[PDB]
Design a protein around this ligand. Structure first.
Ligand SMILES: [Ca+2]
Ligand SMILES: [Ca+2]
Ligand SMILES: [Zn+2]
Ligand SMILES: [Zn+2]
Lengths: 548, 344, 547, 345
DNA sequence: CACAGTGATGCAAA
DNA sequence: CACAGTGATACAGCC
DNA sequence: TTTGCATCACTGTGCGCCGCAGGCCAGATCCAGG
DNA sequence: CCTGGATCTGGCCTG
DNA sequence: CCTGGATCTGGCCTG
DNA sequence: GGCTGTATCACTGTGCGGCGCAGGCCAGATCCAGG
């Protein structure tokens, strides 16, 4: 005899569907006699406690422009968007939770961990102090999401997911803030809770704002309030700090009112140009923000100083659109690693082709250098050739052994020593923006980041001046300029990366294939419910009962 | 009535439902592109040029004293003759409604290249709320000019708007606003002959009258076949606004209005019902006191317009309509809309 | 308390991996205190009973060039192919069973099925008579089977799978041949047993022959022998019949030594040409076979009559290569449906724009006609516009509602009559090659296939002269000319189709990522063993214990 | 030696490892394509035409009396002066070995278009088994001609071949066959100086001698540096075959042999070990009794040949080698092989 | 006439 | 310094 | 009350291929006027 | 001033 | 005989 | 002695986009050179 919460945890954590759990339960009951598991309706009744819209909560003072009804679960993501024939045509299916309901469901799932942290931090148990919750929000479009047949809108073949992850819960005790919770695996798929799932292009700006504006409305509403929640029989108060860092650079340019990546203003953290980035290469400070971008859009739109296009663009520094999502100025660690690996791949193709001696080359010469590099990488590093740079190819490529393999194909020895010092500096700088706490597990590598960055910049300026004279990539400038400032501000890069969101994107296709109804009007509700149910910390403790 | 298909150049994806074509010195221009303005055209105003059935959108710069305006998606446009354009309302690409008034006029003209002047006008007094789908017109009474604004669609007010129904719209109040473009003042007028709200209607302007016909209401969800003549008198004192219900109206929403001849207008396109599309056209001939709406012949609609579900488009000004049809199930590229040109 | 065979059936049939099963077993044992499930080494110990290489068997006469050992399991599919730098290079990773061991294991995991089937026919369970076992062999190549990083050969990103399916077993009693077993779901993925997995292109002829030649050698050895097998405690005597019907037309043309699909000789069953198939369309007979193709290749190679190349090709009828796998002249029903659906899609597109009245057109208005058809099929029939036509689009397109929706876009009612008559004739003819027993499910629809096919051919010749004068597609000739002879020869066409092998391709794509090691040297063995275990009827009867 | 890269036209994928180039009247032809012959070229014999570094394969028809032969993948080719070519053995694209002898000769020549004549010759007597990787040569002794065949690689015999080891090869017996092309007879000769089997070796033909050097054995799996001179005497009675072991041999397998000058041969390419490739060339100068194998200068190998694992290729006949290198990784298109041309003065 | 899911709901049976 | 698998094997602990 | 099973409109396996899309910016490229 | 073949090129069959 | 801009076109940044 | 549990091995996928194309065959323009 198993409890239905235990059978629910076993069904959702071993990736079983309802149609396969029913066969397993039916065979176990019909062969062993007595009913070991529970039927499907008991599990359906048991999962209502973990979904949002179950527990009573109260905001103080009441949030602006939301309803105080507490039994709201999955709702339509369009938010009453008028689909009449006279208006802008909609072609989007969207389902979402309310934001406060998702927050109270996550906190009531994390209840046992919060009480265990208050026990283990030498604190009390009936403390009802102002808990400060830090969450991490992420958004990423997806491709090749093939739409279905049947009646419905003419839906595009993409999808956009919005997620959040509770990162750290503190409490005020005396004067110091002690940490009663901290996520041990922050870039995991187990803790990235879904919030809104829509089927539209990430570059379709009108549909994107029309779906994402209620979320930012609720988020701005609860950015300045206090949530009272009865946790274990005692009411406790919760403040929230929302930190949007799970975005790639293109979406940051889109939703922050900045130009595209090919512009002359390259950094989403400072007002520098691409020519000035290739001359200073280190010395830059973080200046951009959300309020500054709003003020610069108002300067662009009103045009108070009576200038032409070029002088106004130089005044507002590329801010030519209105921002509608507040994001944190930081670096996505995964895409930074992938972009740096692709730039080093281009460096490896140019150094075996003697471009520093022969500045002109045809296209078949470049194809031959690419063919030689791919064949020798298969020979030495056991790396098959791919056209889209992954993260595993990035982690295997940035090694000194790959530099030895490529240096087998270069006749000169000063080019050998130049590539060796370049990869040595890159591997001295890389563990700072990938470790989750670089002040504890690599503090000497954090202390020598500016010296190694200046040495890397001098090496790029001198020994590779056929490639980095008057131009640089954006991720090289992000890696060489702003990393100690982001470490001094946030404490970690890489913990706040968008990698758990991509692992959730891996889970999304699996739940869409084998854990949802195959109907166009029913897929998003089922995928949202099951992905919320998979990331439940209450159900993940039943699967760790053996080590308890 | 000749219907002719038009091929568009390398920027098909800027034309969206809700664009507006203005006319300056016989040249046609473009406003209300899809998305925020790019670096290839930072102003968003384009040179609408159709010749031998090919459409090329060329950028148009602004003057140094201009205000760089957002692409409004359903504004209220009117010509005001010195010749300029008044736009009000519309949807910002972040789906917020605007209450500004922009005045677009030609600053300087060179050999086939025009520089515009966009000025934002302050509006004080009984101002209208931010809305879209409404109309504006200019009337001339006793040597003075006045802007007549009728209601449209807006969001719920700030004390009645919830995030579960954030994008829900409601029709505006049926008040009539008198906008003065000299001082930027606006006064509202409650008229008892106008009880229902109205949106996406047609508004023809005679000397001192505004003929408002067609439209669609959100409360009862019907398209009424009502016709209202709003007569405005402009004495030395306060103005006198008088509405009059007339018979002969047509059940019309989101139609296109052109002026082929003097005191002669043509209604093209629109929706009679939700799933039913309006394939007929209406000829409106103005007079001194009486108007009449008669039938003209149906133009030869092709097989893809008769089986389309929606259309859009606006008036080019030379008695010529530029209407669009949704393309081959969008997909990646390969044209999302099928555009046409209808001559009268 | 569960036996390890029951826990193995639960882990296999509910698509559970070994790691997820270990998690479930660990938490059930930790929260209950009992041992409900069995640990994974007990599942591995009970797993070896169901794999080939466990039971003793004996052949009489012994098989030529085949070993006598009975404990052979998963062997290397290269079969000792030399891989030094002097000779022709290898590029594949292949693993396979022996053919006799796999057929013995497949016959032994259906032991209770054979015993109950001979019980239900009022026979004795101690009969040792000669059982005739006819199997259905299928082979299909796949694409987008992505390569892995690591040490190993330069592998292509394609895969070829060989499989078989035991269709029916028959004992000779008295003077007639009464059947004991019959597969109820022949196109199912629960009955298509994998035999050989390899990583190569199907269009690479040398590597395909080098891997498939040991299997054809074993099959040719077993074609004229007899197998003794102790089943139920009594030795039984089996003899086998192999039917290669699970191939599409492209693989049949490549393997049986015939010309490609766009040739002037269009039928893989007879010797007609495309023009005379476009003129007659009904009146043909099946002439081609494997021995005749070998004789024609010998006539081509020896050239005994001293002819030119064109007269020699006219004498040989396109057999310019040597065949190496014996296949029977049948018709794949799935690709027949897909090809006929694409042909009717092109007919609808050419009927919208009235090519029968204006024969010349640019490609832009052809794209316009295709766009109009796509929009109206999305509006009316709720059909999403697809690029590659599949079977569900064929099933939804072949309706009278679809032609009633298309008839809104064309002006004339003569074309309405023509299209409605054409779709009515096609729907009268389709359940003859789709049903698994047309002699019992639709005998009225079977007995007038000739009249309906003659009416369909006359309607193609008259009302669609602008497209089908001088050229006809291959599957139309196959459909209109041959299938009464094929159903008279066999009894069914849709049962021998290759839909089961495509469902096996789906299972292969699942098992490659979810139930196998992620190594180049270890993925094919794990996928072959797990796909063998998934197809086991002994484990599949455990999940039907509610009877 | 000048090494020059050659671009190939719209049929890159017909050249496979194991092709053979024949030479007729100064023109180079092609045989042994990949796969069975298509309808664009039903014979499989192509016109090997390299001019201003571009290769175009044009089809070549056969005569009406010809036999349409399969593409053999590792035959034994030799020239026999009408001028003709003798091929024996090889692999059919269904991976079966052949024992036929085909005689390729020019039937009629027109303005830059050649029609061939392929005749299959009956072989009776002490016939060799079907094999590949072997060699054949023609010797001239006292106004008569004889074909000298040495052993190669074959499959296991029919009473020793199992399906679990179906594609396993074993070296042939070291017997020497004397093939007469007048009557189609063959007699074998057991010689005590030849104990090991040999495959992929080089065989140079003087008047009545055959110099067999290099090779690779399968039993001991080494490449021996042995050199054998097979002297054939052709009297009125039975022939006398005498082998002689000489010093000076080289450890060579799968090499390319060309004849740049009269009584002067060049060994290009091959494998010295398995993972080790042979980047040196050997100059062989024949005499009346003595031969010597000296060093020549190493040609300037490019960066993709020095780091390739395998090569292949054959002799064009004008002292010019056509060798190939596996396509840089290959993305299933855009040339699966990189070809070169090496000239020798 | 492919076939084994995909999950919520509704109603009959226990 | 992503992280939760993927399955066979080998060896330690224990009953 | 708790179990069990039907019902609903859909899914995938049915083929290929290479760099692309989107946007920005500086250098050729060219056409007609200061 | 033909004209008799080489040879691209696009359309059509199966996947 | 310039030459002063319009305007394609290809390369480079992020996905 | 035998049954159970856990570490180890080198790898996986989610990290981007599009359109018809690959292969082969055959007939129809298309063009270049010999009387
Ligand atoms: Ca993405
Ligand atoms: Ca396939
Ligand atoms: Zn910066
Ligand atoms: Zn036929």
């Amino acid at each position: 005899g198993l409890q239905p919460a235990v059978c629910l945890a076993i069904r959702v954590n071993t990736f079983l569907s309802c149609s396969q759990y029913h066969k397993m339960y039916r065979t176990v009951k019909a062969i062993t006699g007595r009913q070991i598991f529970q039927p499907l309706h008991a599990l359906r009744n048991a999962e209502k406690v973990l979904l949002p819209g179950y527990h009573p909560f109260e905001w103080q003072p009441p949030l602006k422009n939301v309803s105080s009804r507490t039994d709201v679960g999955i709702i339509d993501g369009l938010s009453g968007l008028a689909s009449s024939v006279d208006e802008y045509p909609v072609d989007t299916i969207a389902k979402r939770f309310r934001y406060d309901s998702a927050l109270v469901s996550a906190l009531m799932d994390m209840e046992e961990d919060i009480l265990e942290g208050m026990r283990s931090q030498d604190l009390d148990d009936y403390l009802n102090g102002p808990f400060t919750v830090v969450v991490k929000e992420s958004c990423d479009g997806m491709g090749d999401v093939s739409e279905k047949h049947g009646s419905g809108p003419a839906v595009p073949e993409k999808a956009v997911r919005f997620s959040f992850t509770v990162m750290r819960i503190t409490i005020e005790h005396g004067s110091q803030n002690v940490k009663v919770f901290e996520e041990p695996k922050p870039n995991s798929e187990l803790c990235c809770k879904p919030l809104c799932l829509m089927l539209a292009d990430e570059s379709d700006h009108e549909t994107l704002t029309a779906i994402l504006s209620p979320l930012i409305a609720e988020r701005e509403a609860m950015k300045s309030s206090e949530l009272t929640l009865e946790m274990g029989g005692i009411p406790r108060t919760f403040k929230f700090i929302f930190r949007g860092t799970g975005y790639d650079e293109k979406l940051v340019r889109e939703v922050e009112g900045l130009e595209a990546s090919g512009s002359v203003y390259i950094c989403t953290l400072c007002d520098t140009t691409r020519l000035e980035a290739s001359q200073n290469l280190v010395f830059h400070s973080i200046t951009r923000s959300h309020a500054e971008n709003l003020q610069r859009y108002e300067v662009w739109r009103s045009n108070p100083y009576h200038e032409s296009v070029e002088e106004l663009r130089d005044r507002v520094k590329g801010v030519s659109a209105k921002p509608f999502i507040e994001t944190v100025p930081s670096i996505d660690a995964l895409h930074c690693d992938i972009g740096n690996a692709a730039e080093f791949y281009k460096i490896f193709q140019l150094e075996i082709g003697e471009v520093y001696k022969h500045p002109n080359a045809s296209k078949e010469e470049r194809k031959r250098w690419q063919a030689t590099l791919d064949k020798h990488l298969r020979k030495r590093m056991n790396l098959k050739p791919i056209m889209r740079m992954n993260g595993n190819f990035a982690r295997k490529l940035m090694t000194q052994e790959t530099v030895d393999a490529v240096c087998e194909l270069i006749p000169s020895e000063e080019r050998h020593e130049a590539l060796r010092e370049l990869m040595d500096l890159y591997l001295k700088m890389k563990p700072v923006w990938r470790s989750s706490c670089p002040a504890k597990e690599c503090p000497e590598s954090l202390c020598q980041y500016s010296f190694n960055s200046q040495r890397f910049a001098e090496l790029l300026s001198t020994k590779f001046k056929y490639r980095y004279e008057g131009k640089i990539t954006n991720y090289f400038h992000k890696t060489l300029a702003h990393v100690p400032e982001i470490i001094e501000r946030d404490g970690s890069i890489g913990a706040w990366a968008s990698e758990g969101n991509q692992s959730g994107n891996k889970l999304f296709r699996r739940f869409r294939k084998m854990n949802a109804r195959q109907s166009k009007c029913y897929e998003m509700e089922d995928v949202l419910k099951h992905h919320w149910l998979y990331t439940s910390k209450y159900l993940q403790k039943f699967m760790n009962a053996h080590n308890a | 009535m000749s219907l002719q298909m038009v091929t568009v150049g390398h920027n098909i994806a800027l034309i969206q439902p809700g664009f507006s074509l203005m006319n300056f010195d016989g040249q046609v221009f473009f406003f209300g592109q899809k998305g925020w303005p790019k670096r290839s055209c930072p102003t968003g105003v384009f040179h609408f040029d159709i010749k031998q059935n090919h459409l090329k959108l060329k950028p148009a710069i602004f003057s140094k004293d201009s205000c760089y305006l957002p692409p409004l998606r359903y504004p209220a446009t009117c010509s005001y003759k010195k010749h300029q354009y008044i736009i009000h309302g519309g949807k910002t690409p972040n789906n917020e409604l605007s209450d500004k008034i922009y005045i677009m006029s030609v600053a300087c003209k060179n050999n086939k290249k025009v520089t515009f002047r966009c000025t934002e006008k302050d509006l004080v007094g009984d101002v209208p709320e931010p809305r879209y789908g409404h109309s504006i017109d200019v009337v001339y009474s006793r040597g003075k000019s006045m802007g007549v604004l009728f209601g449209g669609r807006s969001y719920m007010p700030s004390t009645q708007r919830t995030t579960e129904k954030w994008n829900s719209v409601a029709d505006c109040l049926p008040h009539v606003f008198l906008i003065d473009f000299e001082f930027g003042c606006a006064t509202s007028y409650i008229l008892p002959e106008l009880q229902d709200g109205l949106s996406f209607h047609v508004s023809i302007a005679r000397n001192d009258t505004v003929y408002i016909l067609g439209g669609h209401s959100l409360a009862s969800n019907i398209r009424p076949a009502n016709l209202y003549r709003i007569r405005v008198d402009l004495p030395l004192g306060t103005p006198a606004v008088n509405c009059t219900v007339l018979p002969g109206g047509i059940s019309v929403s989101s139609a296109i209005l052109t002026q082929t001849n003097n005191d002669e207008f043509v209604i093209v396109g629109g929706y009679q019902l939700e799933n039913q599309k309006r394939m007929v056209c209406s000829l409106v001939s103005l007079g001194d006191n009486t108007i009449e709406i008669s039938e003209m012949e149906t133009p030869d609609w092709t097989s893809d317009i008769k089986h389309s579900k929606i259309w859009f488009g606006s008036n080019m000004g030379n008695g010529t309509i530029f209407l669009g049809i949704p393309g081959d199930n969008k997909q990646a590229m390969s044209e999302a809309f099928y555009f046409y040109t209808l001559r009268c």
